[PDB]
């Protein structure tokens, strides 16, 4: 169960989610791909959470300050919903 999610995450291409979120903040090509990728974790709360957490992990070094960090987190919490998916009820994104 926990190992099965480990393997699904190694197989995932969540870079379009990063791009969709960064271009969404700058103001789709990447949303269609990102949502298909997030769909692999739909209705699996622990694994959807870990995916969102790994997106935060990958983006921690590339954000320029706390305020940019909080704006990115906000947009990330809305990404499952904007894909027609359920977010996890609880998921710590403080990396």
């Amino acid at each position: 169960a926990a190992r099965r999610c480990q393997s699904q995450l190694e197989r995932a291409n969540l870079r379009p989610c990063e791009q969709h979120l960064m271009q969404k903040i700058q103001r789709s090509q990447h949303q269609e791909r990102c949502c298909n990728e997030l769909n692999e974790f739909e209705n699996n709360q622990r694994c959807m959470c870990e995916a969102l957490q790994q997106i935060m992990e990958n983006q921690s070094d590339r954000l320029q300050g706390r305020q940019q960090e909080q704006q990115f987190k906000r947009e990330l919490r809305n990404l499952p919903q904007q894909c027609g998916l359920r977010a996890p009820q609880r998921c710590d994104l403080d990396v």
Partner: antibody
Amino acid sequence: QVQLVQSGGGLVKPGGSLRLSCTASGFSFSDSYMSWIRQAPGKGLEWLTYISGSGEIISYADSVKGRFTISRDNAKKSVYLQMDSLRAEDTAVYYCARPSDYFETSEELDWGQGTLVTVSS
Amino acid sequence: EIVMTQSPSSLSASVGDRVTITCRASQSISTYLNWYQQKPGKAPNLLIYAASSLHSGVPSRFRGSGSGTDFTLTITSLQPDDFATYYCHQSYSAPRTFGQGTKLEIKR
């Protein structure tokens, strides 16, 4: 340390209007959904509506759609419920609620003190 | 609206008994099922979230199980403070809905 301080409510005639307000501290109000729940005398809990942090996502229970309006002011850390076209059925204690996290699925956790709303001629 | 149907509506038991409350959803809600306790005059307290996860401070005697449409709250060894009303609650889709509630009374 979460505090939810409600105000308003009271007595109103059928067909009248009341406005409930709720002020929050101790969490990131602007990132959190917020919801209103009521409980009539001797009845069960009845979920009514919630509002996303941005205000762009809103849902209403079938029993209230078209009569109540939820809104929020993140700068005041407050969420409001405009109750219109009230009926005797609406008599209940009304609760402000905060969820356990900052997603649209996060379950209610912290409750305001409750406000008694009485609809009677 | 997703209809949440709890059974039984009432239940009597003694200190030390094993209680089980069931909740049936109108449709598949995955694990997005929550359980609350309410004592009279007081606001509800969350016991379980995500259909299996204990909230902080909730004693271990409370246990939740189920996925999809059928769910169960169990109290392994009932205690004096456990006599109250219990509600299930889905946050799978809005508008959210509580079950009608289950009152747990003292047997004699």
